[PDB]
Every structure is written in C-alpha cells, then in structure tokens.
Amino acid sequence: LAKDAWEIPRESLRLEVKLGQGCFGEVWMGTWNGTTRVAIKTLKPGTMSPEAFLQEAQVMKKLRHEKLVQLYAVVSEEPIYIVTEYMNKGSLLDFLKGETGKYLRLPQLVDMSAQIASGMAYVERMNYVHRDLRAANILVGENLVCKVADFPIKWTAPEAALYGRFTIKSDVWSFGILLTELTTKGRVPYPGMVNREVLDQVERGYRMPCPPECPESLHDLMCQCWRKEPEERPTFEYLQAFLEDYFTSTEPQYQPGENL
C-alpha cells in the first residue's frame, strides 16, 4: 500500500447531502478540510475491486483541463472515497430538462456545446476515448459552465453498437446525438423508437431530422457527426470552433423564437 501525495485524511471529508446512488457506490455533496465544496464518489465493497474503481484515478490524475471535472484528492485503502470538484446543477440531462431548462435559447445551448467539445478536444489531443458521451454524463455549474467527466445504443455509433469499435470518431457520433439533446432540451433521441428500430434504421440510412425551430446550420453539423464512415466525421477541434463562432460566421441573422 504505497500511494501518491493526492492522499488526504478521511476526517477532512464531511459527507453532507446525498446526490444520487447507483450500482457502483453512491455520490455526495460535502466539505474537504475546513471549507471547499466537494463531490465525494465512493465504492461499495461488493461491486468491483480496489484496482477497478481506482482506474478513474490513474487517469483523472494525469488529465487536467478546464472542461474535464477535476479530481481534487483520493482515499485508496477501502472504504474508497474519490473527492472531486463540485458541480452544482447536476447532469446536463437534469438541468436541461428541469425548471431553468425552459428558459434556455440557442445562443445558450450552443455555447454549452462548444464547452463540451472543448473538453472532448482535450480528450482528443491526449489519444483518449470516452465511450459514453451523452448529456447524462456532462455536469453543469455556475454560469452555465459544462464539464465532461464521471445500454446506451441510441447515443452510440453503429460501428461501436455492433462491432465494438470505439474511437474518438465514434465519440463524435454521440456528440451529434448530444446536439439533439441540447436542441430539444432533454428528450431521448429517436422519439418513440425502441433500440432495435434505431439499429435497424440508422443501418438503412435514417437520421434524426431537424428538431423544432433548430436552425439548419446546426442539423448539418449533426449529419456531419453521423456520417457512416467514421474517418470523415469532423474532429472535436473543428466542432469546437464552429460552435464558438456560430452566431457570427454561420447564423449572424438569428432571431429568438418560441423555444430556441
């Protein structure tokens, strides 16, 4: 049991409000040392081994970026506690689907999306691969900030859904699905379809239409993310810049509508 200087006393932590749960332990709001808000992820001794739930610290240590949720400190010898930065509006999905959700318009959702891509472009640069990129795995905070971090066939690229080839380009596919999430404010993609239809239909060439009031320059870039041949889908670096300049270069004559 030799460990890094990320290591803290497990009395400095102060598990306060229970955020949620799940199969792989639970997650809490709280306090580390005196002040500092913190998320506190834990492992249930029951599910997976010490080496398993201390892989996402092998990585979460090396990876520092503005839009990846930052590891603050761990406690390795079980019971386990991963302490990270607090994101205080919950997943992208909740946020976008709850009280504030209805007030967001396109400038705001496009900006969120530019941030997600900024993070998936740092992911990109490091030759990493996320493998489950969707709104539910994005977290939101003060100032509409959005950080990446942490069976979904509907968000997953064909080549991964069937042949298990996850690549950063198969991540781009989900990005485009995630663009439907931002643009309809929370809705499951492919509405009123079970998974076999989604696999069936994307295979015969179907693609989600343009959502209500969604400018057609947005949809094009969803279709760019949904190209059959994965080497063609654009990089997170292209995606990011496009979304950064959206309202000057692409739609500089955009007027706010009923919803977007």
Ligand SMILES: CC(C)[C@H](CO)Nc1nc(Nc2cccc(Cl)c2)c2ncn(C(C)C)c2n1
């Ligand atoms: C327990 C889960 C349901 C939630 C969201 O998926 N997990 C969660 N919520 C977080 N925040 C949060 C804030 C308000 C309400 C709720 Cl439910 C969650 C959070 N902040 C930082 N992290 C991790 C990167 C450690 C977080 N993780």
